[PDB]
Write a protein that binds this DNA or RNA. Sequence first.
RNA 1: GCCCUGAAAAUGGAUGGCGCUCAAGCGUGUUACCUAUACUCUACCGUCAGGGUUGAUAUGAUGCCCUGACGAGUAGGCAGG
RNA 2: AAGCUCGUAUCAGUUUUAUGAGAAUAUGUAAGAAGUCCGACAUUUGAAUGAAGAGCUUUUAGUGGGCCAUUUUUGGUAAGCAGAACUGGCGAUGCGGGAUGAACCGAACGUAGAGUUAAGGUGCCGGAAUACACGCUCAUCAGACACCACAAAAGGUGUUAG
RNA 3: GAAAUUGUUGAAAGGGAAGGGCAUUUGAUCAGACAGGCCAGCAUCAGUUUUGGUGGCAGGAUAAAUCCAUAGGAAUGUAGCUUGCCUCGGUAAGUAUUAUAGCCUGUGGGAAUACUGCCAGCUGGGACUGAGGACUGCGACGUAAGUCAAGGAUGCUGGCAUAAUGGUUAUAUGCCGCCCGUCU
Lengths: 51, 56, 147, 170
Amino acid sequence: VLKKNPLKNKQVLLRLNPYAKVFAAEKLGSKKAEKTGTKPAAVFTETLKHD
Amino acid sequence: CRQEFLERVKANAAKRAEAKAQGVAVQLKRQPAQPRESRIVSTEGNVPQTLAPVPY
Amino acid sequence: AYQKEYETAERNIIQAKRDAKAAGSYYVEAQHKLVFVVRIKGINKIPPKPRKVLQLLRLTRINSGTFVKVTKATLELLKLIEPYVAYGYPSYSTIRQLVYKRGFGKINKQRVPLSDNAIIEANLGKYGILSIDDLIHEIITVGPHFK
Amino acid sequence: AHFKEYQVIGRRLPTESVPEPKLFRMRIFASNEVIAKSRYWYFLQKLHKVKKASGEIVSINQINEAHPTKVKNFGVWVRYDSRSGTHNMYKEIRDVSRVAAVETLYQDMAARHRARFRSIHILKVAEIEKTADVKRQYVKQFLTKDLKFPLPHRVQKSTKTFSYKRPSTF
RNA sequence: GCCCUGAAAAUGGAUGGCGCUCAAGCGUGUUACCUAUACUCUACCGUCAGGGUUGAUAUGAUGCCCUGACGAGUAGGCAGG
RNA sequence: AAGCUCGUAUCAGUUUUAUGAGAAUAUGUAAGAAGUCCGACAUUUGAAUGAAGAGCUUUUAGUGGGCCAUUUUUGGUAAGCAGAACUGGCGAUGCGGGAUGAACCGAACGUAGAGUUAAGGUGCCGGAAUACACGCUCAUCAGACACCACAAAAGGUGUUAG
RNA sequence: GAAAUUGUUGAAAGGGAAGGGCAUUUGAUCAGACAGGCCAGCAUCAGUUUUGGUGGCAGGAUAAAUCCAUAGGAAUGUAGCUUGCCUCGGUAAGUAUUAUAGCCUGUGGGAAUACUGCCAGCUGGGACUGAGGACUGCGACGUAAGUCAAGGAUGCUGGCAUAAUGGUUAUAUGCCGCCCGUCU
C-alpha cells in the first residue's frame, strides 16, 4: 500500500541489504586507514610552487 | 559505405567461423569509442613549462 | 564482497596517485564511464532536435532523472543538450540514497516500488542480478546488463 | 566567488609517432576545479592549435600558499578586453595571499572598468619583496614606519529600531 | 568607467508612486530569505491500460477486486446522463 | 472509427561508424536470415538509445484568410517595408513575474493539504535583510534594467584606474 | 394569482460606484445525535518535510600554516657606538645584523585545525497526514513460546451534549477581478 524509505525504518532497511547488521559492529565509515610513509618528489614540489 | 557494410558482414562471418574452428568467444558486435582508462605518465622526457598567457 | 570491492578500488587508486608523486609521475585517472542527468527546463519552448533527445533519454518532465553510459555518442548528446540539463559523475552514496528512496522499477508496464529483492529476482533473476545491491553494482560498475 | 589557486597540467594527446607531447601547465584562479579546467582549455587553445578532444589533463594540484601571516605587497600584470578593444595594465596591491589579492582585484576591475571575469586574462601575479620598486602611492602611503591613523565617525548599527540616547560616535 | 553637455514643447505628470545619495543607484561576490495551478509526497474523483474474478450461499457481468500512469484544449468527433 | 495481418513490431523531427552530393550546421542512403555458400551458418543474428505499439484495405467530420522572432539572401534611411527558403511563438492556451499589455523571461492546468523551487526580487506601498564585502558617482530634470523613447561624432580646469 | 415594478414594517450597510470570487469575524437563522455524537489535549510509532547540537572517518604538499631547531640576509634598522646642537634626550645621519626589540627567506622535525567528501553514527525540537479495514508475506528480537517501530493508527484523558463546532445569509475586512453574445 505504502512505501517506507530505508535510510530509516531500519526494519525495512534490513528487509533489504542485511549487510547493515554487521556493518553496525565495525561501523565501517571510521575505517582507520593504515598510514604509509610514501613521500613525494622534489620535482613535484618545484613544479607545483615555482612558475 | 555499402562497401563498408558488405566487407563488415563477411568479416563477421569469417571471424565467427574462426572462433568456431578454434573455440573462443566470438566478440562479433561492434562498440563505439570507449572511455580511456588510467595510464601513467612521468615528466622525464620533459619537465613541464609554464605557458604564461603574455601575448599583449 | 561488493563493499570490499569498492574500498579496494578506492585504496589502490589513492596509492597510485601517491606512488606516482613519489616517483615523480602524475597519475591520470580513468575517465568516468557513467553519469547522472537531470532536466531543468520544462516541457515548453523546446526545439524538436533536443525534444526527441530527451524523449529518448526518458527525460519527459522537469526534475526527472536517470543515468547514462558514457560513450562518444552519448557525449555528443550531452554536448547537444547542454543548455537544458545538469550532469556529473556520481558516487555510491548518492546512488544508494536514490535507489533506496526513489527507486521505482518497471514490471512489464506499470512503475512499481521495489520494496523487496523478490521483485528483483523475479524480474532480473534472468541475468543473475537478484538484489538491489547487485543492481547498484551493475550501475556503478557498468556491467554488461546496464541497458 | 571565494577564489582558489590551482595548478593544471595538460597533455595534447597520447599518439603514435608523437608520444608524450612535451607538457603544458598553467597557474589558474577559480572557485573550484571545473572552472579552472575550462579556463585552462580556453587559454591553451589561444596559445596553439589544439582542442579538448586533441587535449587531455595530466593532473592538477590545489595550491595552499606558504605564508598566510605574511603581508606581501603584490604587483600584477593584466590584459583584458573592455567594451572597446583590448589593452594591458600593471597594478600594485598590498594584500595577504595571491588568492585574496586577486579576489580584491577582480572586484576592483569590476567596479572601475565593468570587468567581468570572462574577458580578463591574468598575465602574471608576483611579489615585491623590497621597496624602491613600487611606483604607485595608494600602496606606498601604508608603508612608513610608526604608522598610525584614526577611524573617526564609526557608523554603529543597532538591531533595535528605537533608542533613547541620541547617540555618539566614540 | 562614473558624471555634465550633446539629447526641447505647448491642459498638471511621473525609475510604477513615495522618496532615495559611505544609497533604497551603477559594477562584482558570498550566504540567507520570499512565492506559481510547474517539481516531490499523500487522500479523493474521473478516464485509460495490464492482471485476477459464474463458483458454491445472494442480490448487479456494462459488475467486483488489485496495481500503475495520465488529466489543459475552439471547430469537429465519441460515450454516458 | 470498422476490419485484416504482425507483436516485439516495424521504427525515430536523434546521435555515432561508414560514405556520397554540395567547409561546419544542415542533407542522402547501409548498420544483416528478406543475408552467406552448393543441403551447411539462430539471439554476441551483426552500433548506441527509447518505445500506452507497428503496417495494409474501406470510409467519415473540420480545415485550406496569416502575424511576429532567429538564420541564409536582395534593396535601401528604414518603418506598423518589401523579394525568396529552414526552424520556433501565436492563433484554440490558463498560470507566477515583467507596475498594466497582441509578441519578453519562466511554466502548460482535476479537486485539496504540506514541502521546495523556477523567472523576478527583499527601504515602505508588498510577503522577504535598511545582510555582509570591495570600488565608483554628488547631476540648477543624477540614475534605477536587456530588446517594454536607445543617438553618436565629439566638447568638458569634475573624479577615479591606467 | 408567479416576475419585472411599487409601497409599509423589521434587520443591516453607505465618503466619486455597485454586483462576483478565496478565508474569516460580528449579527440573525437552522437541521442532525447523545439514549454510543461535537470539540480538544498528552504519550508512542509510521509517511513526507524542516531546523539544531554533538560523535567517528578518508583525503590534498599525508594540507599549507602555527610551533621547535637550524644557515644566511636585509630593513619601513633593535640594542650598542659615533657625530651636530640641545629644555641636557631628542631629533638628522652613519655605523651596527640580535646585541637591552625582532623580522624575512631556505632547510629539517611532529602534531592539530580549517576546507572538501563519507557513515546502513547517535540524539532532540516543530508542522501536515491517519489513507486502508478477520488472517496470509519479505522481516528483526531471541534458546524459545511468543514480542515488535514488520504489506497505511492506536491508546489514555478531559469538557459539551448546546446553536458550542459546522451550514445558509446581509455586512465589514485583506487580496483579486476590464462587459456579455457575435463577424473581424
